[PDB]
Write a protein that binds this ligand. Structure first.
Ligand SMILES: N[C@@H](CCC(=O)N[C@@H](CS)C(=O)NCC(=O)O)C(=O)O
Length: 100
């Protein structure tokens, strides 16, 4: 699909991409973690896109294996959700990625 090719372009062009929903506490949490690191992520709020939201979500599951939000990409690579991102941070992998 065109939506799949567009996601690939979005995540290769933007250092941090968070596919989010505005009401989700885990999305807020991961937004805050990147803010504390000095990053300004690109946020895509899937609940604020009309019927494109659920279509995008389906393509995200095909690409990433995940059906929850947040769905986080760093340096073009899928990293997971909030707890995945927090674990990557706790290990210093997240900052090593950002540093390269
Ligand atoms: N363990 C996940 C949890 C994320 C989560 O539960 N997200 C909720 C929204 S706040 C969700 O996507 N729910 C949709 C569903 O369960 O299908 C993470 O750390 O990101």
């Amino acid at each position: 699909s065109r939506m799949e090719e567009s996601i690939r372009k979005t995540v290769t062009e933007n250092t941090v991409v968070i596919y989010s929903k505005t009401w989700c506490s885990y999305c807020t949490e991961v937004k805050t973690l990147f803010k504390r690191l000095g990053v300004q992520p690109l946020v895509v709020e899937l609940d604020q896109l009309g019927p494109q939201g659920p279509q995008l979500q389906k393509v995200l599951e095909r690409l990433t294996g995940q059906h929850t939000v947040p769905n986080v990409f760093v340096c073009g690579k899928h990293i997971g959700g909030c707890t995945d991102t927090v674990k990557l941070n706790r290990k210093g992998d997240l900052e090593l990625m950002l540093a390269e």
